[PDB]
Predict the 3D structure of the following.
Amino acid sequence: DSEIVKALGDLDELNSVLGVVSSLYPELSEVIQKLQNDIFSISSEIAGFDMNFSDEKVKGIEELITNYSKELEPLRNFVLPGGHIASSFLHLARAVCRRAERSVVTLLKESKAKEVHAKYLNRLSSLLFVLALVVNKRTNNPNVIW
Amino acid sequence: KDSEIVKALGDLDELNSVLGVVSSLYPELSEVIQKLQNDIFSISSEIAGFDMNFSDEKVKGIEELITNYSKELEPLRNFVLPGGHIASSFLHLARAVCRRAERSVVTLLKESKAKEVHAKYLNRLSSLLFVLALVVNKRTNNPNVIWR
Amino acid sequence: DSEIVKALGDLDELNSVLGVVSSLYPELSEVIQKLQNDIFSISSEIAGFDMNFSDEKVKGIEELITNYSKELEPLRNFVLPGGHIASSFLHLARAVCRRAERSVVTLLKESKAKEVHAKYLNRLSSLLFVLALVVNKRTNNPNVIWR
């Protein structure tokens, strides 16, 4: 499937931007490597393997979204990528993750992916957004608003 | 969620993210870059249904920037490859992602799912990013990398 | 045609990520600029020019893969992007290079690209992965590994 290879390709780019983020903001290495691990596992299942990837994974993202949000304050306006370099790469990560989300959904409608795959990616982009806001807040970088 | 529209919007989001990376790396151009990001968000917004009278004045604004920034540059006699100062390399990348976003919006031009001004702007923008990449290398004393 | 344009765009994105790597790890600038030079020559050929880009290019890449791999030990894990910043960007380069490969291979089937283009790009992604490990090895950054 040219569709399968596309999805895998979007996933590889995502894992790569994630590594960039990790390299720039080591403090989040532990959390980002776990997300990268999950992406590789998702990639392996789409490729034909079976890691028994379950919904527990998605709830795990939800939990992170919640715990990191406790540091943030209200999305007053719309945020434009900016601030700390790592924050800007988290935005890039969010965008690539969303592209990978569209690709996985495409395979999902043909039964070549699991709903948990598309769902995990759906929550992941949200978490990536929260992490960009977190980086700017910890490093005292104002977010850029529209 | 018409795959062609969400795709165009995805490319635009990536473009604004790369532009943010440039701004982080070269804060001396943040003011100019944020204005470009604001324009990308407006374009994106209109394509998503929220028209905001995005005017062709925007395009003129870019052509003007292209003109004033080139005044700093010598006549070019080589094909430039991405390189030099880190911000210059990312500007070249912004341009490449801008050209990809340009393609998705042009596709939306048919069926009139996007304005003709959106496509025009993106086109001039990719040219501006090229000029800015050269400007950054010139101001930081970084030779441009050239083909061959 | 839109196929050609998309292929050219992926090659252009690839060349830019390579430029980013060079700026971050200047000690590899000479070899990375040669790859950038070939990507541009390849793009030119797809756009209509002729640089007489030959299999000799491909062989040059395999030689680089071989020689750089000599600094490395046997690999017993799947490596995830990480470590030194330039290593993470080489992985990105590899990913975008694979995307460019897919587009060029699509042109191959319609005789809008040369077989040497596709093969060059296929070898290139392998070289990029090796360069990523070499960078981490030389800068004492452990590779990130699945699990």
